[PDB]
Design an enzyme around this catalytic site. Structure first.
Site, PDB file in Angstrom:
ATOM      1  CD  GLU A   1      -3.034  -0.837   0.054  1.00 12.79           C
ATOM      2  OE1 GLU A   1      -3.061   0.197  -0.614  1.00 12.79           O
ATOM      3  OE2 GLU A   1      -3.854  -1.775  -0.103  1.00 12.79           O
TER       4      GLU A   1
ATOM      5  CG  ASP B   1      -7.556   3.974  -4.778  1.00 16.60           C
ATOM      6  OD1 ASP B   1      -7.930   4.358  -5.881  1.00 16.60           O
ATOM      7  OD2 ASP B   1      -8.295   3.342  -3.957  1.00 16.60           O
TER       8      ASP B   1
ATOM      9  CG  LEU C   1     -11.544   4.011  -0.053  1.00 13.05           C
ATOM     10  CD1 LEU C   1     -11.045   4.672  -1.281  1.00 13.05           C
ATOM     11  CD2 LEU C   1     -12.414   2.792  -0.365  1.00 13.05           C
TER      12      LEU C   1
ATOM     13  CG  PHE D   1      -6.139  -3.593   3.798  1.00 13.26           C
ATOM     14  CD1 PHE D   1      -5.708  -2.663   2.878  1.00 13.26           C
ATOM     15  CD2 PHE D   1      -6.054  -3.267   5.143  1.00 13.26           C
ATOM     16  CE1 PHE D   1      -5.218  -1.446   3.272  1.00 13.26           C
ATOM     17  CE2 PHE D   1      -5.511  -2.045   5.537  1.00 13.26           C
ATOM     18  CZ  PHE D   1      -5.110  -1.145   4.603  1.00 13.26           C
TER      19      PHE D   1
ATOM     20  CB  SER E   1     -10.388 -18.136  -5.813  1.00 12.43           C
ATOM     21  OG  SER E   1     -10.426 -17.626  -7.136  1.00 12.43           O
TER      22      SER E   1
ATOM     23  CG  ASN F   1     -10.225 -20.158  -9.842  1.00 15.66           C
ATOM     24  OD1 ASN F   1     -10.814 -19.490  -8.999  1.00 15.66           O
ATOM     25  ND2 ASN F   1     -10.814 -20.613 -10.927  1.00 15.66           N
TER      26      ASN F   1
HETATM   27  S1  LIG Z   1     -10.928 -16.650  -0.914  1.00 27.40           S
HETATM   28  C1  LIG Z   1     -11.653 -15.546  -2.181  1.00 27.40           C
HETATM   29  C2  LIG Z   1     -12.571 -14.444  -1.704  1.00 27.40           C
HETATM   30  C3  LIG Z   1     -13.912 -14.587  -1.581  1.00 27.40           C
HETATM   31  C4  LIG Z   1     -14.589 -13.349  -1.078  1.00 27.40           C
HETATM   32  C5  LIG Z   1     -15.479 -13.548   0.144  1.00 27.40           C
HETATM   33  C6  LIG Z   1     -15.439 -12.757  -2.151  1.00 27.40           C
HETATM   34  N1  LIG Z   1     -13.415 -12.569  -0.687  1.00 27.40           N
HETATM   35  O1  LIG Z   1     -13.557 -11.249  -0.540  1.00 27.40           O
HETATM   36  C7  LIG Z   1     -12.158 -13.071  -1.279  1.00 27.40           C
HETATM   37  C8  LIG Z   1     -11.674 -12.283  -2.469  1.00 27.40           C
HETATM   38  C9  LIG Z   1     -11.125 -12.978  -0.196  1.00 27.40           C
HETATM   39 CL   LIG Z   2      -9.079 -22.311 -12.909  1.00 28.30          CL
HETATM   40  K   LIG Z   3      -1.929   2.590  -2.147  1.00 24.64           K
END
Ligand SMILES: *SCC1=CC(C)(C)N(O)C1(C)C
Ligand SMILES: [Cl-]
Ligand SMILES: [K+]
Ligand SMILES: [Cl-]
Ligand SMILES: [Cl-]
EC number: 3.2.1.17
Length: 164
Positions: A11, A20, A32, A104, A117, A132
């Site tokens: 950051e 940003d 933010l 974050f 993912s 992914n």
């Molecule tokens: S582990 C992937 C993921 C799912 C969700 C709840 C949408 N999250 O914000 C992240 C991007 C961490």
């Molecule tokens: Cl994939």
């Molecule tokens: K930043």
């Protein structure tokens, strides 16, 4: 290396309001302020956050105080998300930091996609999850940061950060 050091790398630290990577008014270590295009709205957010009239500039100590609150917020929010807490709790502490990093950057609520993912991470299919995760707006818009976060998920090491 720990989540604070990791996010400080990703950051940066700036003591005056700036925009940003998405064009949004921000200060400190990725705090933010608002998505409004009004600089005056951003300055009101800042003054409210610090508790004094800042006119858009803060000290390092003030930046670090917002950062501490924002990391704490991210973690609490993961736990408050029934869709994410099990994934977080399944991970080791290094990979937990990678998940905090994503929250974050993206937000504690309202994030679109990434269900597949998160499943692959819960399954501990690390190379598959890494592939992914890269199929994303996130990876295309901030590829160097995303590559670091993804390496952290793939390996469970700090290799992408140690040396930075
Ligand atoms: S582990 C992937 C993921 C799912 C969700 C709840 C949408 N999250 O914000 C992240 C991007 C961490
Ligand atoms: Cl994939
Ligand atoms: K930043
Ligand atoms: Cl306000
Ligand atoms: Cl980047």
């Amino acid at each position: 290396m720990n989540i604070f050091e990791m996010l400080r790398i990703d950051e940066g630290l700036r003591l005056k309001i700036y925009k940003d990577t998405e064009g949004y008014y921000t200060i400190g270590i990725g705090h933010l302020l608002t998505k409004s295009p009004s600089l005056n709205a951003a300055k009101s957010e800042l003054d409210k956050a610090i508790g004094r009239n800042t006119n858009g500039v803060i000290t390092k100590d003030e930046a670090e105080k917002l950062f501490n609150q924002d990391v704490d917020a991210a973690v609490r929010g993961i736990l408050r998300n029934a869709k994410l807490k099990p994934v977080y709790d399944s991970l080791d502490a290094v990979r937990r930091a990678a998940l905090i990093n994503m929250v974050f950057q993206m937000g504690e609520t309202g994030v679109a996609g990434f269900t597949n993912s998160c499943r692959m991470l819960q399954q501990k299919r690390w190379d598959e999850a890494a592939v992914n995760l890269a199929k994303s707006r996130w990876y295309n818009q901030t590829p160097n940061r995303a590559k670091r976060v993804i390496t952290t998920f793939r390996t469970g090491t700090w290799d992408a950060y140690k040396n930075l």
